[PDB]
Amino acid sequence: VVPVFVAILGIIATTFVIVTFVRYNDTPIVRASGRELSYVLLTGIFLCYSITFLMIAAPDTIICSFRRVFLGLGMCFSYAALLTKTNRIHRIFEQGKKSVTAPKFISPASQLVITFSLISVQLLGVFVWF
Amino acid sequence: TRVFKKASPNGKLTVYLGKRDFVDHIDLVDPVDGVVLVDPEYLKERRVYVTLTCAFRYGREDLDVLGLTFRKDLFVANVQSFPPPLTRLQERLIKKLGEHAYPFTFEIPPNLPCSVTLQPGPEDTGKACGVDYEVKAFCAENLEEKIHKRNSVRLVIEKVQYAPERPGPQPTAETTRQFLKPLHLEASLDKEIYYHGEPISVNVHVTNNTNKTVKKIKISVRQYADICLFNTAQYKCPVAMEEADDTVAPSSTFCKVYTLTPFLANNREKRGLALDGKLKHEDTNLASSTLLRILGIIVSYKVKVKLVVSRGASSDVAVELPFTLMHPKPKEEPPHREVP
C-alpha cells in the first residue's frame, strides 16, 4: 500500500507544478528557465511515478517488458534535460572564447535536438537487448 | 567663454550648459550648473521644471528570443526653476541674457555609476545598452501630470573618471605546479596604470625541473564587465592575444619579454563589449577601469599567461595580473566627435 500512496502524492504534486507553469507561461522565470527543457524534465518525472505500479503488479510478459523499457527511460529523460540545462548555464557562465563576436548560445531549438539524441541513445540501447 | 545651448521645437524654452563632461573624484562630483530662458507670455499659469535622470538598460542575444529586457532608473532629481548661491557662469549668463533667465543646479550623489555603453550589433536600431545620464527641462502646470514633446528639451551629459596621479605597485605573479620536481612560472608587468593606445610589456620567466616540455606560450589581455543590477552573469572577453611556439626543454630555464596592445580595430565584431559613454553614435575607445574605494557596469582588465605542457593530453599552467586602463586628465574638454 505505502508505495502506491507515495506515488499518488507525488503525481498530485507533479500535476500542481505543471499546471502552474502552463497557467503562467509568461513570467520571466518560466521564460528564462528553459521552458522546453523544463517540460521534458517534468514529463520524465511524470513517467517516473507510474513505474511503481508496473513493479508492484504481478509478473507477466507485457509487465516485465514495460518494466525493462521504462525503468531506464524514467531516469534518462530527467537527467538528459538537466544535462542540457547545465550545459546552457555553463555556456552563458563563461563568455568570449578565443574568437570574435558573441559567445555561442544554445538556442531553444538545439536544446530539443540534444535532449532527444541523448534519449534516443538509451532507447536503442534498451531495444537491442530487449 | 563657450557654452552649449539647445532650444525646444517651438523655440520658447532654451537651456544653456557650460560643459558636457562632469568628473567623478569618488568623493563628491562636479555639480551640474545650467540656465533656462523662458517666455512668460507663452505660459499663462504653467511652471518650468528641470529634472536629472540616470538610466540603466540591458539586453542580451539569448534573452531576445524569450522577449526579455531590463530597465531601471537609478537616480531622479526634480527642481522648480521659473518661480525662484549662484556660480560665476550662471551669473554671467543671466547678465548676458535678459530678465527671463533663471538658474538650476544639480548635485549627483557620490558612489553612483559612470557612463558606459555596450557595443551594439549589426542589426541594433534604437537606444543602446548601458548606463547614462540626461537633463530634461519642461513646462507643465503640475509635475506629475504629462510631459509634452514640444515643451521639452533633453541633453545628454557624461559622468567620467580619469587616471590616478600616483602609480601603484608593480604587478607580479608566481606559480608552482608539481605533477603526479616542480615547474615554476613567474610573470610581471612594467607598470600598473596604462593609457589607451600605449603598449603593455609582460616579462615571463619559466624554470622546468620536470621531465616535461612546454610546447606553447599564450599571452592575452582580457576585459571583465559586471552587470550588477539584476541577477545577471558577468561578461568576459579577450581583447588582445599572442601565441608563441617557444619550447622549454626539461632541466632548463627560459626568460622572454612580450608586448601587446588592445585596440578597437580588430574588436569591432564583439557584441556586448563595453565602451566609454556616447552622446551619439560616434566612435569611443574601450571602456576605462572603474575606481570603487556600483549599481551598474563595473569594468576590469587583466593579463593572462598560459603554458601548454603535455608530454605523456595537455595540461595548462597559468597566471593572471590585474591592471588599470584609463585616460589622463586633459587640459581641454574632449570633443565627443571625430575632430578631423
Side-chain angles (χ1 to χ4, degrees), chain A residues 1-65 67-69 71-126 128-130, chain B residues 1-11 13-292 294-340:
Chain A
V1 170
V2 182
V4 164
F5 273 40
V6 163
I8 291 298
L9 184 77
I11 197 67
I12 297 169
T14 287
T15 297
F16 280 4
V17 185
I18 193 66
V19 65
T20 297
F21 268 40
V22 171
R23 182 176 172 183
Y24 281 69
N25 205 354
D26 291 331
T27 175
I29 297 171
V30 174
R31 288 183 191 266
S33 285
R35 265 177 295 198
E36 287 88 329
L37 293 194
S38 287
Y39 287 144
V40 171
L41 159 65
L42 286 162
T43 295
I45 301 299
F46 165 78
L47 188 153
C48 181
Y49 285 126
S50 294
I51 304 318
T52 186
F53 291 129
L54 287 166
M55 295 296 172
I56 188 154
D60 197 5
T61 67
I62 177 165
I63 294 170
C64 292
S65 73
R67 289 158 164 206
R68 261 205 87 189
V69 299
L71 194 50
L73 261 62
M75 322 285 198
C76 182
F77 266 76
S78 299
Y79 300 144
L82 283 166
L83 181 48
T84 310
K85 184 93 192 53
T86 306
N87 259 318
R88 289 223 51 223
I89 297 177
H90 196 317
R91 213 80 72 76
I92 294 175
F93 193 53
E94 71 270 13
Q95 272 149 283
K97 289 289 186 181
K98 320 293 214 59
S99 53
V100 304
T101 188
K104 303 331 170 214
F105 284 125
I106 305 178
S107 64
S110 165
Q111 298 163 41
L112 295 173
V113 169
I114 313 161
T115 297
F116 281 132
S117 163
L118 289 170
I119 294 169
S120 180
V121 172
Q122 168 71 8
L123 283 168
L124 67 94
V126 166
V128 170
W129 199 27
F130 176 76
Chain B
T1 65
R2 174 162 171 231
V3 306
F4 310 97
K5 61 172 187 172
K6 198 160 139 185
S8 70
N10 305 118
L13 193 150
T14 318
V15 180
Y16 296 75
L17 299 172
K19 287 181 322 211
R20 299 296 281 266
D21 289 331
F22 301 85
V23 186
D24 174 278
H25 310 281
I26 301 167
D27 48 350
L28 189 147
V29 190
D30 289 7
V32 178
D33 313 308
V35 174
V36 68
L37 170 85
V38 298
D39 197 357
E41 192 52 88
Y42 171 93
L43 61 84
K44 263 71 69 178
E45 292 166 21
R46 293 182 280 189
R47 299 96 169 283
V48 168
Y49 298 109
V50 186
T51 188
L52 176 63
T53 303
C54 177
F56 168 87
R57 288 161 324 266
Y58 183 71
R60 205 172 54 225
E61 166 165 346
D62 49 345
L63 306 162
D64 280 347
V65 184
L66 303 171
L68 303 170
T69 57
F70 304 100
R71 296 187 97 206
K72 195 169 169 58
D73 298 89
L74 303 179
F75 158 73
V76 162
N78 308 325
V79 304
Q80 194 215 47
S81 292
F82 158 65
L86 271 175
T87 76
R88 286 281 320 152
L89 177 58
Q90 306 174 36
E91 286 187 290
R92 280 192 322 187
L93 265 165
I94 291 187
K95 174 212 301 163
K96 156 199 174 45
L97 305 166
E99 191 284 359
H100 301 140
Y102 304 109
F104 66 86
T105 310
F106 286 115
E107 205 52 67
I108 301 178
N111 300 324
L112 272 192
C114 282
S115 284
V116 173
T117 52
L118 310 165
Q119 204 176 197
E123 288 184 353
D124 201 1
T125 73
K127 294 181 176 67
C129 318
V131 61
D132 61 344
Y133 290 80
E134 67 180 1
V135 302
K136 179 184 68 186
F138 56 98
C139 199
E141 284 284 328
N142 198 325
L143 190 136
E144 39 190 357
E145 286 94 4
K146 189 55 179 168
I147 293 187
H148 293 321
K149 169 191 76 193
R150 52 178 188 268
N151 290 318
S152 78
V153 191
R154 287 153 199 245
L155 285 171
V156 188
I157 57 180
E158 293 208 19
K159 175 180 177 299
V160 294
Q161 276 167 335
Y162 289 112
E165 61 285 340
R166 73 290 182 281
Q170 180 169 18
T172 174
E174 165 166 336
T175 187
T176 297
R177 174 82 210 111
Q178 55 189 34
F179 292 97
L180 190 59
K181 277 71 66 179
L183 173 48
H184 194 73
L185 163 71
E186 280 158 58
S188 75
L189 310 184
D190 47 302
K191 80 189 92 156
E192 179 212 272
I193 297 148
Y194 288 94
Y195 296 144
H196 296 277
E198 300 290 339
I200 304 170
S201 183
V202 56
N203 186 359
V204 310
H205 180 81
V206 188
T207 179
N208 188 74
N209 307 305
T210 69
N211 287 349
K212 296 270 181 273
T213 305
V214 172
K215 309 175 316 178
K216 272 165 293 150
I217 297 162
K218 285 156 189 31
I219 299 183
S220 58
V221 182
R222 309 175 47 95
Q223 182 207 79
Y224 303 87
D226 284 321
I227 295 92
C228 64
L229 182 43
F230 290 81
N231 271 311
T232 313
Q234 163 193 66
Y235 178 82
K236 48 197 87 166
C237 187
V239 288
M241 189 90 205
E242 158 170 25
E243 327 190 328
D245 283 276
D246 296 328
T247 69
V248 188
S251 309
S252 278
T253 187
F254 167 81
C255 186
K256 210 196 198 323
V257 177
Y258 298 75
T259 311
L260 287 89
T261 312
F263 54 93
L264 193 60
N266 48 350
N267 298 309
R268 273 198 219 260
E269 302 190 42
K270 310 193 139 86
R271 197 191 140 170
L273 181 78
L275 313 157
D276 269 325
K278 290 179 191 288
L279 269 43
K280 289 290 184 183
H281 310 114
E282 85 266 2
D283 281 335
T284 48
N285 51 9
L286 305 168
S288 293
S289 280
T290 300
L291 316 163
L292 286 168
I294 61 171
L295 294 176
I297 294 93
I298 305 158
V299 188
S300 314
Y301 281 92
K302 292 200 212 143
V303 167
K304 183 165 178 175
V305 173
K306 176 174 296 285
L307 307 165
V308 176
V309 64
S310 178
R311 292 293 88 194
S314 307
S315 63
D316 311 332
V317 184
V319 300
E320 301 216 70
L321 301 102
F323 72 95
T324 295
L325 192 74
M326 280 183 134
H327 272 316
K329 207 192 210 295
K331 300 294 187 291
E332 311 266 339
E333 200 200 72
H336 300 297
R337 54 181 301 121
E338 189 185 359
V339 177

Short mmCIF file of all heavy atoms in Angstrom, two decimals, chain B residues 43 68 72 85 94 104 170 202 250 273 287 296 300 304 312 314-315:
data_model
loop_
_atom_site.label_atom_id
_atom_site.label_comp_id
_atom_site.label_asym_id
_atom_site.label_seq_id
_atom_site.Cartn_x
_atom_site.Cartn_y
_atom_site.Cartn_z
N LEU B 43 3.45 80.94 -21.39
CA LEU B 43 2.89 80.15 -20.31
C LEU B 43 1.98 81.03 -19.46
O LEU B 43 2.43 82.04 -18.89
CB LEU B 43 4.00 79.50 -19.48
CG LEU B 43 5.08 80.28 -18.71
CD1 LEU B 43 4.63 80.74 -17.32
CD2 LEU B 43 6.36 79.46 -18.61
N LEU B 68 12.83 39.41 -23.34
CA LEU B 68 13.08 40.00 -22.04
C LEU B 68 14.05 41.16 -22.17
O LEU B 68 15.09 41.04 -22.83
CB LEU B 68 13.64 38.96 -21.06
CG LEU B 68 12.80 37.72 -20.81
CD1 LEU B 68 13.60 36.70 -20.02
CD2 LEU B 68 11.52 38.08 -20.07
N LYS B 72 15.75 50.31 -15.48
CA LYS B 72 15.59 50.88 -14.15
C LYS B 72 16.14 52.30 -14.16
O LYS B 72 17.03 52.63 -14.94
CB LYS B 72 16.30 50.04 -13.09
CG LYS B 72 15.89 50.37 -11.66
CD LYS B 72 16.40 49.33 -10.68
CE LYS B 72 16.23 49.80 -9.24
NZ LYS B 72 14.81 50.10 -8.93
N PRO B 85 22.84 80.30 -3.81
CA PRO B 85 24.22 80.53 -4.26
C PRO B 85 24.37 80.37 -5.76
O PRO B 85 24.19 79.27 -6.29
CB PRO B 85 25.01 79.45 -3.51
CG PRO B 85 24.01 78.50 -2.92
CD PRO B 85 22.63 78.96 -3.25
N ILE B 94 23.07 85.00 -16.93
CA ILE B 94 21.91 85.83 -16.61
C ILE B 94 22.17 87.28 -16.98
O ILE B 94 21.26 88.00 -17.42
CB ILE B 94 21.53 85.67 -15.13
CG1 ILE B 94 20.98 84.27 -14.87
CG2 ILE B 94 20.51 86.71 -14.71
CD1 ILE B 94 20.44 84.08 -13.48
N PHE B 104 19.45 76.69 -12.61
CA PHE B 104 19.24 75.43 -11.93
C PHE B 104 20.59 74.78 -11.67
O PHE B 104 21.56 74.99 -12.40
CB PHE B 104 18.31 74.48 -12.72
CG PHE B 104 18.89 73.99 -14.02
CD1 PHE B 104 19.70 72.87 -14.06
CD2 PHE B 104 18.60 74.64 -15.20
CE1 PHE B 104 20.23 72.43 -15.25
CE2 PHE B 104 19.12 74.19 -16.40
CZ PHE B 104 19.94 73.08 -16.42
N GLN B 170 54.11 47.45 -8.71
CA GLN B 170 54.34 46.69 -9.93
C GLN B 170 53.55 45.38 -9.88
O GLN B 170 53.62 44.65 -8.89
CB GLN B 170 55.83 46.40 -10.10
CG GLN B 170 56.17 45.60 -11.33
CD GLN B 170 57.67 45.55 -11.60
OE1 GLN B 170 58.48 45.83 -10.72
NE2 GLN B 170 58.04 45.20 -12.83
N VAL B 202 55.07 42.48 -20.90
CA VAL B 202 54.99 41.43 -19.89
C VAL B 202 56.25 40.58 -19.98
O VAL B 202 56.62 40.11 -21.06
CB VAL B 202 53.72 40.58 -20.05
CG1 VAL B 202 53.62 39.99 -21.44
CG2 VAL B 202 53.68 39.49 -19.00
N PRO B 250 63.23 20.02 -20.84
CA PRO B 250 63.43 19.60 -19.45
C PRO B 250 64.80 20.00 -18.93
O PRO B 250 65.78 20.04 -19.68
CB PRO B 250 63.28 18.08 -19.51
CG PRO B 250 62.44 17.83 -20.71
CD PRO B 250 62.81 18.89 -21.70
N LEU B 273 30.72 44.25 -25.95
CA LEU B 273 31.96 44.76 -25.38
C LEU B 273 31.75 46.18 -24.87
O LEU B 273 31.19 47.03 -25.57
CB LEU B 273 33.06 44.72 -26.44
CG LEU B 273 34.47 45.18 -26.06
CD1 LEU B 273 35.19 44.11 -25.28
CD2 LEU B 273 35.24 45.53 -27.32
N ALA B 287 36.32 50.76 -22.82
CA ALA B 287 35.91 51.37 -21.56
C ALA B 287 37.08 51.48 -20.60
O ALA B 287 38.02 50.69 -20.63
CB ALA B 287 34.78 50.56 -20.92
N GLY B 296 25.89 49.53 -11.27
CA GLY B 296 25.89 49.42 -12.72
C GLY B 296 27.02 48.56 -13.24
O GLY B 296 27.55 47.73 -12.51
N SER B 300 36.87 45.86 -15.52
CA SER B 300 38.17 45.46 -15.02
C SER B 300 38.98 44.88 -16.17
O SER B 300 38.43 44.41 -17.16
CB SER B 300 38.06 44.44 -13.88
OG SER B 300 37.09 44.83 -12.94
N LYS B 304 46.75 37.54 -18.89
CA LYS B 304 46.82 36.11 -18.59
C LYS B 304 47.98 35.50 -19.35
O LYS B 304 48.15 35.75 -20.55
CB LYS B 304 45.51 35.41 -18.97
CG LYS B 304 45.47 33.94 -18.64
CD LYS B 304 44.05 33.42 -18.71
CE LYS B 304 43.99 31.93 -18.42
NZ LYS B 304 42.58 31.44 -18.37
N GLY B 312 53.45 12.99 -21.95
CA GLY B 312 52.57 11.84 -21.84
C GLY B 312 53.13 10.59 -22.49
O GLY B 312 52.38 9.70 -22.89
N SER B 314 47.03 17.43 -22.73
CA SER B 314 47.87 18.59 -22.45
C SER B 314 47.35 19.30 -21.20
O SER B 314 46.14 19.50 -21.06
CB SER B 314 47.89 19.56 -23.63
OG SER B 314 48.24 18.90 -24.83
N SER B 315 48.27 19.67 -20.32
CA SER B 315 47.96 20.45 -19.13
C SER B 315 48.39 21.90 -19.33
O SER B 315 49.29 22.20 -20.13
CB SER B 315 48.63 19.86 -17.89
OG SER B 315 50.04 19.90 -18.02
#
